[PDB]
Amino acid sequence: TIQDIQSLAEAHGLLLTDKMNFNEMGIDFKVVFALDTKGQQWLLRIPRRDGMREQIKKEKRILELVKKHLSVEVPDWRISSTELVAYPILKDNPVLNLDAETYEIIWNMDKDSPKYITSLAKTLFEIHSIPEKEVRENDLKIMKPSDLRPEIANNLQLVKSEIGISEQLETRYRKWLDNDVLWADFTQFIHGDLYAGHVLASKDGAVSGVIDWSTAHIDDPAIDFAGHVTLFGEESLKTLIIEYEKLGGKVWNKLYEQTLERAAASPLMYGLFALETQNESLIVGAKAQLGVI
Ligand SMILES: [Ca+2]
Numbered sequence: 001t002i003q004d005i006q007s008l009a010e011a012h013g014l015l016l017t018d019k020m021n022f023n024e025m026g027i028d029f030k031v032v033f034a035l036d037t038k039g040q041q042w043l044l045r046i047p048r049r050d051g052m053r054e055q056i057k058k059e060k061r062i063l064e065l066v067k068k069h070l071s072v073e074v075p076d077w078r079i080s081s082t083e084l085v086a087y088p089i090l091k092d093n094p095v096l097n098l099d100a101e102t103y104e105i106i107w108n109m110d111k112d113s114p115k116y117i118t119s120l121a122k123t124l125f126e127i128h129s130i131p132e133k134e135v136r137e138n139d140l141k142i143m144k145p146s147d148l149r150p151e152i153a154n155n156l157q158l159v160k161s162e163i164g165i166s167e168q169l170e171t172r173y174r175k176w177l178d179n180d181v182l183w184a185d186f187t188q189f190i191h192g193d194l195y196a197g198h199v200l201a202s203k204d205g206a207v208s209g210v211i212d213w214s215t216a217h218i219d220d221p222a223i224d225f226a227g228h229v230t231l232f233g234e235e236s237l238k239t240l241i242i243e244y245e246k247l248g249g250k251v252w253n254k255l256y257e258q259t260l261e262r263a264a265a266s267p268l269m270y271g272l273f274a275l276e277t278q279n280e281s282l283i284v285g286a287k288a289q290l291g292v293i
């Protein structure tokens with residue numbers, strides 16, 4: 001009940017009024033939009049069933065680490081567990097969200113915004129500069145540069161044998177794995193699931209926050225550029241890379257070309273996720289993205 005949730009928040013230190021609205025669009029969570037007794041708006045997440053324990057533990061450690069090194073806001077998980085996740089509403093809305101009924105992409109920001117490019121580049125620089133020693137201390141996954149390709153090769157085998165893959169996607173992924181010059185000889189801490197729907201910004205485009213941190217680890221930095229090129233296009237990605245390098249972002253000759261292969265590999269990564277988030281709904285939609293059907 002609303003009273004049940006009020007008790008939990010009280011049982012973890014937070015006093016809420018009895019006025020809540022519920023949202024049902026989530027896969028793993030139900031979402032509650034609450035209000036504390038002083039009038040501040042809150043976001044509650046209640047995982048549906050058992051399963052979410054290690055992700056909620058990990059994401060809380062990631063949030064506490066990244067806020068130390070970011071000049072923009074991330075969710076402040078004052079209550080954190082599979083009983084209840086609660087944080088105050090952040091300052092801005094995402095630059096886009098997906099309409100819940102149709103998945104039509106509704107944009108809260110001008111795509112051409114110069115300020116989005118410069119502030120996203122600065123945020124990318126800040127995320128990718130987080131020291132490996134600190135990532136190690138928080139027990140997060142660390143991919144070495146020489147492990148990247150065998151990892152993907154394993155991913156390709158597993159997704160092929162169970163979900164299936166179009167012949168054209170398989171040949172492109174193998175071409176990718178064969179193209180040595182595309183692969184950086186270093187890895188860095190990355191957000192892991194970064195695109196405009198996970199970036200909060202003012203209407204002028206200035207990044208004010210970044211959300212959904214549960215995938216963050218040390219990996220190929222191009223992963224954090226793929227979501228931009230998919231939505232903003234090749235020319236915008238080039239300007240982003242230039243602003244990034246201007247700030248001291250560590251680049252290599254083929255970062256642009258590697259980012260395009262990463263973006264094209266989206267079907268593979270989603271088929272990988274769908275195999276450990278078991279739904280007929282997900283493997284079917286992953287199947288279509290891979291050129292089957
Ligand atoms: Ca900070």
Ligand SMILES: [Ca+2]
Pocket residue numbers: 178179180
């Ligand atoms: Ca080769």
Ligand SMILES: [Mg+2]
Pocket residue numbers: 063064067075076077
């Ligand atoms: Mg915090």
